[PDB]
Amino acid sequence: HWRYGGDPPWPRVSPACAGRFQSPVDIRPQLAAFSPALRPLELSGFQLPPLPELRLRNNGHSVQLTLPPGLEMKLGPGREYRALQLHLHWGAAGRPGSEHTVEGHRFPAEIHVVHLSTKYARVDEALGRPGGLAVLAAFLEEGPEENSAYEQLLSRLEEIAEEGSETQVPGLDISALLPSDFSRYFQYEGSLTTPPCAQGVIWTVFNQTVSLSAKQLHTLSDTLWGPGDSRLQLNFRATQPLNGRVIEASFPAGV
Ligand SMILES: [Zn+2]
């Protein structure tokens, strides 16, 4: 009815998942259109105080952190957004699980911060409308040191190991979960990557990654359980054909 790696393949139950402009996609940087209109991203309100706490929950498909009101993200003139939630996609032991790929390369994991256009008061109004939702996406890679910002979330996974369980976590700097380079990114129009696969979503994928320790990546991929009694692993959708869409780059590809 809705699960990674099997049946139903999604269009049988959610026809919009067979649309022509779906996400995620494979990014080929030498083929992206360099677009100097794409200026550095602007975030405000992402540095949260310790109280009030946020909600962290295992929904069977990911771990999702609900963000409080007041987080603003600007992609450019006329493209202002309010953050709603973030969640992650990952693989398993020795197997990467990012959703986007770069030249076919899959990264260990990926963070998605989902936002609602300021044109709309409610998510339901914005579904399927061009630009109504925007997602910021960054790849997570292995580095040598523990990532202190991620540890605030990863240390709480054990208590929400069971599908459907929830907890509360202190406010933290949400921007410290994202790359520091706000100037280099790719952007394209796609869809939600889970059913109902609604189109019109503006995807922004940072070029720079974030680094977590090997232990932290194991904690992320190995702690949670999903539907039935499977481990919550490999929770990524396969990449989708561009079907003529152009991916834009905010920076000149190096090579
Ligand atoms: Zn996602």
Residue numbers in the entry: 140 to 394
What's in the article?
One of the isoforms, CA IX, has limited expression in healthy tissues but is upregulated in aggressive tumours, with its expression being controlled by hypoxia. CA IX is a multidomain membrane-bound protein, with its catalytic CA domain facing extracellularly. CA IXSV contains only the catalytic domain of CA IX, with the intracellular, transmembrane and PG domains removed.
The small P21 monoclinic unit cell contained two CA IXSV chains (one per asymmetric unit) with a volume of 123 080 Å3. We conducted a careful OMIT map analysis of the structures and found that in all four structures there are one of two ions bound to the zinc ion that come from the crystallization conditions: either acetate or formate. Furthermore, comparing specific residues that compose the active site shows that the overall architecture is maintained between H/H, H/D and D/D CA IXSV.
